[PDB]
Amino acid sequence: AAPAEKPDPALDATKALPKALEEVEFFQSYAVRRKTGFHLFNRATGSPTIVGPMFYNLYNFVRIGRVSKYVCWLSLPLVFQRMWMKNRATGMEYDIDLENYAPFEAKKNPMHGH
Amino acid sequence: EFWQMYLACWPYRFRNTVVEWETCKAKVLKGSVDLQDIVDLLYLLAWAYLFWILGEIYGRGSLYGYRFDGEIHRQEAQNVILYKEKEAQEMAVVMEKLEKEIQEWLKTME
Amino acid sequence: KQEPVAAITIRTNEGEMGVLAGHEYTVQQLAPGILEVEYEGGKKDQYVISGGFAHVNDTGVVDINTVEAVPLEEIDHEKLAKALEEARAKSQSPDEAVRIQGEIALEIFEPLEAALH
């Protein structure tokens, strides 16, 4: 009942967005690159892409990593494994009798339950 | 040393793809195409034919040849033609029978 | 001083407004530009202004206070023309003290350049 509290500056919000912009500026500072060896495929209009000019920053951070740059790529061969096996499976020849007796994940199969 | 140079050479290659393409276009239109250019283009077409075969192998999914081709698979179209002919032949008879039955029931009751 | 007037047209930040007898009571900024006054005799009189505030009473009494008021007749496009590129050079010259001055001089010259033409 009527405590008469003065304003506390610690409860204000005048540093969160500046700090976030400081972090983002620290991020974008590592995107600075030299002119030598520079190449970027622009769009057909000649205008730049979106993701294109922000690959150097990501790979400059990958440069500074220690373990992820030597581990996180080992899941990438698995993508080509799928690319190959999918194409093998798009046209795989199978037995008609076995397909009619044991269709995979087909509906109204009483052996499954429904 | 080679890994560093192999990486560093990628920008040069991607930059000179368009450059070499434009000169090739200019040389074909202008007609100023010489023996060395012809040899390089023939080497290019050989490698392209090889990678075309390789892409066929990758896209088929089989290393030997296509699948679901052959007279065993082509005959199913003629089998379907005959099956549809038989099915329509029987369906016309059944529909005529049912229509006669319905016309009987209607002209008897209605 | 309290002259009978049929209608008056004003320039504002929101845009351009028209004022008639018994207009709704309103007060707002005047944007630095020109002003048009139409008397009951069908005539017209135009005045360059520098901002100010216009108060319109419901009874039909308009009080306008400005920092300057000069007719269009007392300004020439000739002398105005030279100041245009001066304002543009001030706007393009990167300097916080001069860029704003270029912008403001251009802000006042553009209605004048459009009104004389």
Add this chain to the structure above:
Amino acid sequence: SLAKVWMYASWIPRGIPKAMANELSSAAAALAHPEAIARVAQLESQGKNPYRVARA
């Protein structure tokens, strides 16, 4: 014009691999040693193909 028609027709073909190309170019500019990049620029000023030189 016909150039604009060709542009808007070949946009979608031309733009499929542009991402990986820019990715590899930037990753090369980042991860490769700048001495190697300078040597590449040197050979390109000398009219040579630095990829063939490296393999050789």
Add this chain to the structure above:
Amino acid sequence: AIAYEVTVNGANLIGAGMAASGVGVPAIGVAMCFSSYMLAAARQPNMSAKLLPYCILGFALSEALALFTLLIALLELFVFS
């Protein structure tokens, strides 16, 4: 194929409601027109005499569309079987 013709007498009276659902939408246009005339006259009473025809115009056109919708619902019943 076999040809079965059906005549649904119930559909005589459904579409009347389906049209009746839309009869109320032009009323908002009506009130929008009158609201515009009111706020415009309050902004400039002198212009009221000039906007009165427009007001009468903008109502009637909106009102006419409602009438056409309403007419369909009444034409659906007392002539059709």
Add this chain to the structure above:
Amino acid sequence: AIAYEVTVNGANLIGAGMAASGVGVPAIGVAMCFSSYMLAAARQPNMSAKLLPYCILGFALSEALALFTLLIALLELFVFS
């Protein structure tokens, strides 16, 4: 072709709900009229007396459209079988 007359007695009452759904749309304009007349009278009290007939007129015309929809709903039942 074959001919089936069907009489759907249940459709005597399905359209009434759609009409009733149409009865509530005009209220947006009903209130929009008074909502205009209020603001007008605030921005100019003196013109509040001269905009009064327009407010009554606008309300009545919006409400008449609502009434016609409602009239269909009552006529849909107590005469139809």
Add this chain to the structure above:
Amino acid sequence: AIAYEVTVNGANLIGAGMAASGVGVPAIGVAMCFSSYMLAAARQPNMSAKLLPYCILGFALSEALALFTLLIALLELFVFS
């Protein structure tokens, strides 16, 4: 042609929900009136007394249509079979 008469009893309770869907559509135009009264009182509190007769009038008669929409669905059930 043949005459098949059907009496759909479920439609008696379907149209209850159909008219029920339109009972809340007025409510926006019900609270719109008091919203306008608030904005007008904020504009000119001295006018607040002169406006509330033209508020309750626009309020209740916007509410009234909802009643006409609600009564139907309640009369639809306790008498009809």
Add this chain to the structure above:
Amino acid sequence: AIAYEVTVNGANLIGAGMAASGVGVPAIGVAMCFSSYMLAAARQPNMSAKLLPYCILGFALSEALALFTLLIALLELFVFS
């Protein structure tokens, strides 16, 4: 599978109300245009003559879609069996 062609004559009439509900949707844009012209006139009486050509234009083209929406439902009945 057996093939039964059916011709539903009731559907000749249902669509009429469904388009009739769509005849009122342009009616709000009608007053949106007339209100635009009114408020622009109160903004500047002197420009009233130069915006009138865009009033009758801005109505009639919006009214044109209201005509075609009304045209179908009237074409739906007196020619279709």
Add this chain to the structure above:
Amino acid sequence: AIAYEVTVNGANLIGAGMAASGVGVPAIGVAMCFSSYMLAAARQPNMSAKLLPYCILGFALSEALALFTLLIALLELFVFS
């Protein structure tokens, strides 16, 4: 003509989703009243006390229609078979 009575038991529930669809459309009218109260207080802070009596009244009676719209859907199910 032969009398085929049908009692559709599924129809007990379809209307409940329609009334439930109409329980939402009052909510915008409800929040409109408090939105008006907020902007009215930001227009006149000290007036916030004398507007709150005219703020709950528009709150309940807009909420009240939702209740009745909500009432039917609950009265449609727990008593009807």
Add this chain to the structure above:
Amino acid sequence: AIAYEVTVNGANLIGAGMAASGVGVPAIGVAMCFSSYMLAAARQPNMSAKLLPYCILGFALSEALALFTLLIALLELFVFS
């Protein structure tokens, strides 16, 4: 299980009603687009010359959407059985 293929010829027309209900929606964006040019010209007559391309561009696309919906409705009947 048994397999009855049916071809409903009445359903040739029901879709045309819904399409005709959707032909009137873009009229709102039409009037909003001409209205914006009106008000923007009232606020700045001198700029009216270079806003006309923007106005016709917006109206033409909005009208195209209406036209495409209408085209579906008219293609649904005069070719399909």
Add this chain to the structure above:
Amino acid sequence: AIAYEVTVNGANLIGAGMAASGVGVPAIGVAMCFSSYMLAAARQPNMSAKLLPYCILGFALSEALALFTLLIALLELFVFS
């Protein structure tokens, strides 16, 4: 007359979809309230705290109506046989 009772088990779900379509309409009233709070605070920062109770009161009994509709749609399935 002969009595054919039917129990349509598909009708367990149609109403649930309709009520689900109705669950979204209060969402615009929520952001209406909060947008009003924002513009009131930007108009007058010192009134930021006095309208915060109304910022919470506007959401609570507005989201509740969305929940009653949502409560029906989920009550429509997991209890009715």
Add this chain to the structure above:
Amino acid sequence: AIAYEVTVNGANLIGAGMAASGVGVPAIGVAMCFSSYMLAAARQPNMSAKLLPYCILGFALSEALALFTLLIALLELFVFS
């Protein structure tokens, strides 16, 4: 009397679309919050930090009902047979 139980499997996938029509109706209210935050910061940039909580607060709530509307249609298919 007679009793025919029927299990309509099409209503499994009809109600999915009927709920899917309503998933977008919150989005127009969702964007209202960020539009309000924009214009409020345009009136007072210094207050943009104190209103940003109410901006995030205004999104996740308004977005939530859309998600709840999306739940039923996804609850309708991947569990019911």
Add this chain to the structure above:
Amino acid sequence: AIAYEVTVNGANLIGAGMAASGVGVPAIGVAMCFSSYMLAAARQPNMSAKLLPYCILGFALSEALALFTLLIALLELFVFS
């Protein structure tokens, strides 16, 4: 229980109008983007060049959702039997 599979060929064409109805809703957003850009330019002519990029962005991309709303109806007929 017995199982009657049915193939309703009319549903090939019914849905065409159902999707078609939603093709004109985006038009209001599309025209809204220009109705914004006009007023913004009337507020600040000099900033017209920096808003034009974000004036065609939303223009074509709201039409993109309209395109996918239209692409279904065109994918509904000329491929399905």
Add this chain to the structure above:
Amino acid sequence: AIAYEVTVNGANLIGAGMAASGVGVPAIGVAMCFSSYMLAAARQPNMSAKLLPYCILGFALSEALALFTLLIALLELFVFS
């Protein structure tokens, strides 16, 4: 009692139209964000850089709900028989 299961294959598509019809409602919320950014920069050009992140954020969120609605329509057809 007797038990007739029915599998309506036509229902594979009737919902797809409704799901497609709901894709265009968020487009107004989509353009509402760019319109807000336009008017914000039109009142304060210097703040244009600090509000552009909010602008991109809002476009994606409004667009996502339309995009979420689209998933049902595309999921309704290419897998279900």
Add this chain to the structure above:
Amino acid sequence: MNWLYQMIYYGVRMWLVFVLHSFSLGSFGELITVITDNNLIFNVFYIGLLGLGFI
């Protein structure tokens, strides 16, 4: 009692948010992969190996 109600409401809300957003995102991913597997001209890292992942 409203404390219990609000706790249950927001717990259910968080569960629904996580589940539905994950499911929808995975579904869009699977449809895109089906389109690209059926059109191998597009079965390429078309946005980029790290760009899409970072985003």
